């Protein structure tokens, strides 16, 4: 049977999340490689935090790439087969590209640090943010945003599961969209503790910086199919992969569609590779015939080896 690996992004991290892998030689070597690339002790940052350091986005993005990739390398060290198709959620798309051999891990490290810096400084402080809307289908959330937009730009920017949508834009747009969403019967419509309007058109300046940065990155044709967040496309051309990463930052993460794409390829097993269990839960919601597992410690890895 064919399987997919999906890789998590920001928001899946926690202090101590790799403790259970502390004595797996490849996890140690991956944390060493990350520290060498970034100039700080990534192992201890993850193990000890504090959470306020671990949650700075300039740390969170390389931390989540490292932790999830560590988990991929442990899967291999254990003799796990290559998945037939991969994807990842926002930052996680980078990890997927690394697993697929498109971007060397050593290159991916300063790339995602830079991406974090770019995305955090694209718009002036306090201009915008993000919110989570629960209970409304995608087209209703789009209608909510189109209506709210008279008060400021606001867009539906993460399609995560049925009835689970994140929006992003101006502070005013986000507030009005929550209010409208509630009126239309949303189970929940609440601002997220995020300081920048990620995956909105307001983030175009981040895309522009990413384009300049990726110009100098050696991207290779993947050895595993990667389905991208922005277009739900599987592309092999290095230039196209780069462009999908550029547009990704200021465009919608079509996560539901990526999972459905994977399913239409005849994959029935979808394994979340990395900590936090976020993607595991979304797979269940997107398509209950899919069979989930997760690799985040040695025990879960062995159960995933079975599936």
Residue numbers in the entry: 0 to 306
Please quote the authors directly.
One strategy that has been employed to improve success rates is to “rescue” such proteins by adding orthologs from related species to the pipeline, based on the assumptions that many of these will have slightly different physical properties that may improve their solubility or crystallization, and that close orthologs will have structures sufficiently similar to the original target to be useful as surrogates in drug design. By using an ortholog rescue strategy for insoluble or difficult to crystallize targets, we increased our structural coverage of B. thailandensis essential genes from 31/406 (7.6%) to 49/406 (12.1%).
Here we report a functional and structural genomics effort that applied saturation-level transposon mutagenesis and next generation sequencing (Tn-seq) to identify essential genes in B. thailandensis, followed by high-throughput structure determination.
